[PDB]
Design an enzyme around this catalytic site. Structure first.
Site, PDB file in Angstrom:
ATOM      1  N   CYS A  56       5.207  -6.762   1.793  1.00  0.00           N
ATOM      2  CA  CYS A  56       6.532  -6.496   2.358  1.00  0.00           C
ATOM      3  C   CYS A  56       7.301  -7.952   2.684  1.00  0.00           C
ATOM      4  O   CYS A  56       6.761  -8.978   2.281  1.00  0.00           O
ATOM      5  CB  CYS A  56       6.369  -6.081   3.960  1.00  0.00           C
ATOM      6  SG  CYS A  56       4.911  -6.903   4.687  1.00  0.00           S
TER       7      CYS A  56
ATOM      8  N   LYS B  49       2.852   7.190   5.396  1.00  0.00           N
ATOM      9  CA  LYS B  49       3.690   6.235   4.973  1.00  0.00           C
ATOM     10  C   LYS B  49       3.618   5.026   5.746  1.00  0.00           C
ATOM     11  O   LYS B  49       3.607   4.779   6.992  1.00  0.00           O
ATOM     12  CB  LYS B  49       5.107   6.493   4.859  1.00  0.00           C
ATOM     13  CG  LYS B  49       6.363   5.537   4.938  1.00  0.00           C
ATOM     14  CD  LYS B  49       6.608   5.431   3.479  1.00  0.00           C
ATOM     15  CE  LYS B  49       7.430   4.178   3.199  1.00  0.00           C
ATOM     16  NZ  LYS B  49       7.110   3.353   1.809  1.00  0.00           N
TER      17      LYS B  49
HETATM   18  C1  LIG Z   1       7.681   6.032  -3.918  1.00  0.00           C
HETATM   19  C2  LIG Z   1       6.794   5.142  -3.744  1.00  0.00           C
HETATM   20  C3  LIG Z   1       6.684   4.610  -2.192  1.00  0.00           C
HETATM   21  C4  LIG Z   1       5.264   3.690  -1.991  1.00  0.00           C
HETATM   22  N1  LIG Z   1       5.493   3.419  -0.573  1.00  0.00           N
HETATM   23  C5  LIG Z   1       4.601   2.516  -0.111  1.00  0.00           C
HETATM   24  C6  LIG Z   1       4.315   2.165   1.136  1.00  0.00           C
HETATM   25  O1  LIG Z   1       4.945   2.605   2.170  1.00  0.00           O
HETATM   26  N2  LIG Z   1       3.346   1.285   1.430  1.00  0.00           N
HETATM   27  C7  LIG Z   1       2.432   0.869   0.479  1.00  0.00           C
HETATM   28  O2  LIG Z   1       1.416  -0.162   0.847  1.00  0.00           O
HETATM   29  N3  LIG Z   1       2.509   1.025  -1.014  1.00  0.00           N
HETATM   30  C8  LIG Z   1       3.512   1.865  -1.253  1.00  0.00           C
HETATM   31  N4  LIG Z   1       3.644   2.212  -2.778  1.00  0.00           N
HETATM   32  C9  LIG Z   1       2.721   1.399  -3.499  1.00  0.00           C
HETATM   33  C10 LIG Z   1       1.692   2.682  -3.699  1.00  0.00           C
HETATM   34  O3  LIG Z   1       0.835   2.686  -2.572  1.00  0.00           O
HETATM   35  C11 LIG Z   1       0.727   2.055  -4.967  1.00  0.00           C
HETATM   36  O4  LIG Z   1       0.296   0.715  -4.735  1.00  0.00           O
HETATM   37  C12 LIG Z   1       1.592   1.836  -6.386  1.00  0.00           C
HETATM   38  O5  LIG Z   1       2.382   3.224  -6.398  1.00  0.00           O
HETATM   39  C13 LIG Z   1       0.563   1.783  -7.593  1.00  0.00           C
HETATM   40  O6  LIG Z   1       0.022   3.026  -7.553  1.00  0.00           O
HETATM   41  P1  LIG Z   1       0.304   4.005  -8.741  1.00  0.00           P
HETATM   42  O7  LIG Z   1      -0.044   3.157 -10.117  1.00  0.00           O
HETATM   43  O8  LIG Z   1      -0.667   5.383  -8.771  1.00  0.00           O
HETATM   44  O9  LIG Z   1       1.721   4.523  -8.661  1.00  0.00           O
HETATM   45  C14 LIG Z   1       4.678   3.253  -2.874  1.00  0.00           C
HETATM   46  C15 LIG Z   1       4.848   3.361  -4.322  1.00  0.00           C
HETATM   47  C16 LIG Z   1       5.708   4.210  -4.840  1.00  0.00           C
HETATM   48  C17 LIG Z   1       6.023   4.809  -6.092  1.00  0.00           C
HETATM   49  O1  LIG Z   2       8.882   0.951   0.824  1.00  0.00           O
HETATM   50  C1  LIG Z   2       8.920   0.310  -0.579  1.00  0.00           C
HETATM   51  O2  LIG Z   2       9.983   0.179  -0.848  1.00  0.00           O
HETATM   52  C2  LIG Z   2       7.734  -0.015  -0.825  1.00  0.00           C
HETATM   53  N1  LIG Z   2       7.496   0.220  -2.357  1.00  0.00           N
HETATM   54  C3  LIG Z   2       6.549  -0.416  -2.742  1.00  0.00           C
HETATM   55  O3  LIG Z   2       6.203  -0.117  -4.061  1.00  0.00           O
HETATM   56  N2  LIG Z   2       5.273  -1.012  -2.000  1.00  0.00           N
HETATM   57  C4  LIG Z   2       5.430  -1.210  -0.645  1.00  0.00           C
HETATM   58  O4  LIG Z   2       4.339  -1.641  -0.077  1.00  0.00           O
HETATM   59  C5  LIG Z   2       6.625  -0.637  -0.080  1.00  0.00           C
HETATM   60  C6  LIG Z   2       6.741  -0.847   1.116  1.00  0.00           C
HETATM   61  C7  LIG Z   2       6.748  -2.406   1.786  1.00  0.00           C
HETATM   62  C8  LIG Z   2       7.971  -2.940   1.071  1.00  0.00           C
HETATM   63  C9  LIG Z   2       7.998  -3.658  -0.093  1.00  0.00           C
HETATM   64  C10 LIG Z   2       9.198  -4.092  -0.546  1.00  0.00           C
HETATM   65  C11 LIG Z   2      10.414  -4.166   0.327  1.00  0.00           C
HETATM   66  C12 LIG Z   2      11.471  -4.672  -0.187  1.00  0.00           C
HETATM   67  C13 LIG Z   2      11.669  -5.403  -1.484  1.00  0.00           C
HETATM   68  O5  LIG Z   2      10.745  -6.045  -1.782  1.00  0.00           O
HETATM   69  O6  LIG Z   2      12.653  -5.105  -2.156  1.00  0.00           O
HETATM   70  C14 LIG Z   2      12.680  -4.526   0.459  1.00  0.00           C
HETATM   71  C15 LIG Z   2      12.506  -4.074   1.905  1.00  0.00           C
HETATM   72  C16 LIG Z   2      11.484  -3.566   2.374  1.00  0.00           C
HETATM   73  C17 LIG Z   2      10.370  -3.315   1.458  1.00  0.00           C
HETATM   74  C18 LIG Z   2       9.023  -2.849   1.983  1.00  0.00           C
END
Ligand SMILES: Cc1cc2nc3c(=O)[nH]c(=O)nc-3n(C[C@H](O)[C@H](O)[C@H](O)COP(=O)(O)O)c2cc1C
Ligand SMILES: O=C(O)c1[nH]c(=O)[nH]c(=O)c1CCc1ccc2c(C(=O)O)cccc2c1
Ligand SMILES: Cc1cc2nc3c(=O)[nH]c(=O)nc-3n(C[C@H](O)[C@H](O)[C@H](O)COP(=O)(O)O)c2cc1C
Ligand SMILES: O=C(O)c1[nH]c(=O)[nH]c(=O)c1CCc1ccc2c(C(=O)O)cccc2c1
Lengths: 313, 313
Positions: free
Chosen positions: B131, B44
């Protein structure tokens, strides 16, 4: 229990209209849209000079939506204007006319000659901002200086109520900046969210090949793919522009689809792919379907739920 | 036959791994992903100090995909370093570590501590440019000056090859600019396209309520909704980054979905939504299907069709 709307000083039987570029390029297309049970119609976006547009294939559909790089094929301003002033039966429904000039000059030139006919016949302008300016720069609505320019200029050359067709945004800051720019311009009376989700890529597993010839397969996305994106933009702009109307456009296939658009704050609701696929009879379904929803819930007009989307504790 | 490949000086049983965020926040999660058939896993995204993250409900899945606004909950960087350091069985599969610091200082402070472990143990750094900042200003990735700083300062701090998690672009001029930026940095050896599609909005028609508490319901999209967006960015950055790898991410439910990602230029294929919905058993299926496609077509290797999608004429 009805779907009726009054806005921009026009009366509309329902809120369903076609999305620009769908079933609206030719006089055949336009008569067919008017013969339909659509609330309104809007002509394919125009340039001054007629255009062939890109080489084929350039649009394809699938279970979940469509991709296109048409390249703005149309019959030229003069035709759409002439349809406005001579050929369209305003008694049937109102008409919108879309312009998609490839520079600010081209858009000014057209609106100047649209002006008199807008005043006299009632036709309504949808300025297409989701178009290309100088190549190597982003499409116009992603470029906020170019956006400001286009609206000052068009405002001055038109001096009448008009609306704008916007692309989808995906960052809050862009929502924030874009609405503020638009809020500078009092003649912008409606905002249309959204245009095609730009430059998606569809690949065919069997043949191992992109499905549309232009831009190495890359193209604009519509249908069930883009619905949340569209509900986001509609509701974004509904919230940030209380003196303008929002018109919803993005993945409408069903009454429920429109119902959600309206919930987000949509006044009019346009149909693109789903209309291209199913055809003009889609509009009687959409009406009925939405009215069944309204019946189930005890809603009698659209304003009873427009903008009334709930958020959580 | 087998899906073995070599990348970045590591061996992989097959190109599949989880998408960052899914099944990878707790030690329990990381053990599970490690026990799975994934050829790799990623932690994560994390921050120096632990984060509780946004109020629930903050994630939801539907037949066409998912929406989330988790708010970067994580155990904090010291936990994930400890896992990378003393806990992970590198004999089983390689590990990537995601880092999503709220400032450039925060990132710099984390990479310097990670570098020794990367050297020592072989762990890999996936930097998340999706982010905060802020509000008042766009995501780092949609701000090409802010990206250059982040890459400079991390390139200088870490000093070993790493990769970057990019959000989707929709404009050609961004693909061009975006990639020029990334090509400035020889240490950026891989790009992960694409993060969730930003700020979509799902509304439930019965309740007439958004489905996620934070941000008035607005959140990131994944799943079937974003597939052709992910294929477009994979391919777009495959083409403009000949000296980098591309890792595809977005909307893999099947082997066919992976096959397409690979055709677009993907080396690794990431699974997020579908993984979150089906569990780690999905890795045996995804492997089987992809292999079944290959056999039917007469492909023995991934290299045979990587990046080889056909355009028309
Ligand atoms: C619940 C959830 C948590 C995620 N957490 C992160 C994260 O911590 N960092 C990140 O770069 N992307 C995060 N993503 C984005 C995914 O890594 C990915 O880019 C996105 O879900 C698209 O892939 P999918 O179409 O297979 O869901 C998250 C997505 C979901 C649904
Ligand atoms: O942990 C997440 O919320 C998350 N969800 C995603 O779909 N992609 C991601 O890369 C992440 C982690 C980075 C991330 C992205 C957006 C936000 C947001 C936001 O855009 O609302 C707010 C606070 C923290 C975040 C962190
Ligand atoms: C074949 C086709 C042609 C289009 N032509 C135009 C156009 O000329 N002007 C315009 O502003 N939008 C055009 N669009 C965008 C649509 O108006 C609409 O924004 C988009 O298709 C999303 O709607 P949907 O999800 O209901 O298809 C076109 C879309 C398609 C599929
Ligand atoms: O005709 C279109 O290609 C088109 N398709 C859409 O989905 N929405 C639209 O607004 C338009 C018209 C605007 C437009 C879009 C793309 C191009 C392109 C192109 O990017 O392929 C080239 C020349 C003119 C254009 C005009």
């Amino acid at each position: 229990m009805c779907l009726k709307l009054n806005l921009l000083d026009h009366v509309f039987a329902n809120p369903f209209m076609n999305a620009a570029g769908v079933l609206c390029s030719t006089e055949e297309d336009l008569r067919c849209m008017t013969a339909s049970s659509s609330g309104a119609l809007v002509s394919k976006s125009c340039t001054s000079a007629p255009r062939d547009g890109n080489p084929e294939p350039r649009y394809m559909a699938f279970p979940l939506g469509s991709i296109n790089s048409m390249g703005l094929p149309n019959l030229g301003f003069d035709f759409y204007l002439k349809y406005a002033s001579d050929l369209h039966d305003y008694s049937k429904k109102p008409l919108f006319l879309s312009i998609s000039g490839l520079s600010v000059e081209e858009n000014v030139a057209m609106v100047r000659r649209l002006a008199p006919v807008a005043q006299e016949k009632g036709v309504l302008l949808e300025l297409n901002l989701s178009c290309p300016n100088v190549p190597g720069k982003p499409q116009v609505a992603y470029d906020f200086e170019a956006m400001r320019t286009y609206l000052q200029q068009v405002s001055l050359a038109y001096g009448l109520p008009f609306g704008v067709k916007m692309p989808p945004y995906f960052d809050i800051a862009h929502f924030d900046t874009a609405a503020a720019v638009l809020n500078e311009f009092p003649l912008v009376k409606f905002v249309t969210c959204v245009n095609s989700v730009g430059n998606g890529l569809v690949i065919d597993a069997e043949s191992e090949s992109v499905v549309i010839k232009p831009k190495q397969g890359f193209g604009g996305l519509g249908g069930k793919y883009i619905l949340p994106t569209a509900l986001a933009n509609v509701n974004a702009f509904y919230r940030r522009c209380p003196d303008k109307l929002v018109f919803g456009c993005g993945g409408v296939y069903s009454g429920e689809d429109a119902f959600l658009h309206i919930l987000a704050g949509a006044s009019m609701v346009q149909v693109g792919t789903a209309l291209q696929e199913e055809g003009p009879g889609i509009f009687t379904r959409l009406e009925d379907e939405l009215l069944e929803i309204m019946a189930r819930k005890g809603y009698r007009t659209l304003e009873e739920f427009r903008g009334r989307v709930k958020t959580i504790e």
